[PDB]
Amino acid sequence: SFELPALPYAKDALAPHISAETIEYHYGKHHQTYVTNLNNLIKGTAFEGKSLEEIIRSSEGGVFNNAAEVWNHTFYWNCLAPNAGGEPTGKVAEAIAASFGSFADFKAQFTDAAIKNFGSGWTWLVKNSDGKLAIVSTSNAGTPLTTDATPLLTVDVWEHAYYIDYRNARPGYLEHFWALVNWEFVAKNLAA
Amino acid sequence: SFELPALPYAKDALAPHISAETIEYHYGKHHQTYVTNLNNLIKGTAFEGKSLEEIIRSSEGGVFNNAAEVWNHTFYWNCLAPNAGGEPTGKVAEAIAASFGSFADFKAQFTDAAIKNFGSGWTWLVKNSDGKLAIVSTSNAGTPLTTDATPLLTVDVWEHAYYIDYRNARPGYLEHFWALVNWEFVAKNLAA
Numbered sequence A, B: 001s002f003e004l005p006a007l008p009y010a011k012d013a014l015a016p017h018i019s020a021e022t023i024e025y026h027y028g029k030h031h032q033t034y035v036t037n038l039n040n041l042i043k044g045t046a047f048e049g050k051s052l053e054e055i056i057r058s059s060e061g062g063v064f065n066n067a068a069e070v071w072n073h074t075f076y077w078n079c080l081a082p083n084a085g086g087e088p089t090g091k092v093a094e095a096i097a098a099s100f101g102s103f104a105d106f107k108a109q110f111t112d113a114a115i116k117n118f119g120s121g122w123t124w125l126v127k128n129s130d131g132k133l134a135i136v137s138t139s140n141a142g143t144p145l146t147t148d149a150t151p152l153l154t155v156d157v158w159e160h161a162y163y164i165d166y167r168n169a170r171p172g173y174l175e176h177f178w179a180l181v182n183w184e185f186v187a188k189n190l191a192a
């Protein structure tokens, strides 16, 4: 009985970086469908009373794809915000500087990883179990939740995430992604 | 060095099933970029002098992804045509009827497979070396060329192939795909 969590802002709040139309389809159709599909697939199964994270860590096939995508998108919406972007400060800035050399280095590494993540997928900033930050990419519904690394930030590189606004120019999408990064969410994730 | 083969028709030939803008981007940007990236990866290497097929059957990583996608798209453009679609005749009709019972059954199965293919990929009708026909789906740049089967027909289900025209409605795209199938090409593939 999972529900589609409410968007953290107005559907046109990320314009012009991500259009209101993209949110309408991405959130209203894609994300909503993953929720509906997940609910239908777990009915009557041992997954019924489990948390979303629990299902993601104990499933495969269709149940996994839908559950992971539900979580990935909710995390994604929280990674964005209006009147945000720019450079992080405090603990996040310090951790990024220590793990990548500088914010600029991190930004270039994250951008490159995201652009080169072949096909559909996600690119993440995570804190590995060794306490150091790293950038990793996943394919399709893949998520760091199935590992011992903690997700801090992500960018959806499935084409539906940017085709309406940037067509083939995934790099253009990444450029604008930086103008939307919600460092408050990233900071919360790192502080946990 | 590889050249992007000319499209078998003007970019408006498949409209309204596939729009001129989709062709503009799909052929003019996506396909072209695969050619460019392939060229840059193989320049000055032992992959020079090799056919596209030879590269696909002897590579991995980026070389394979780009080489395979170049071939897949050229094959795809030949699978589509104006004033086509409908149902096959002659040898193609016979083979499909013998393997799937009827064209209607084949059509339903191919469509179902294409819709279910998760993430980016392709759905194919192939002929195994023993003469049996089968429907197989691949992920990302995956192609039957790396197997023992012969590609007869394919549909691109990467989101860029249909998002401009159908957004998330991949089923609608598949319906319109059938109005474009170039059975003459399929017959050539089967007769080889």
Ligand SMILES: [Fe+2]
Pocket (backbone or CB within 6 Å): A026, A030, A073, A156, A158, A160, A161
């Ligand atoms: Fe998405």
Ligand SMILES: [Fe+2]
Pocket (backbone or CB within 6 Å): B026, B030, B073, B156, B158, B160, B161
């Ligand atoms: Fe394509």
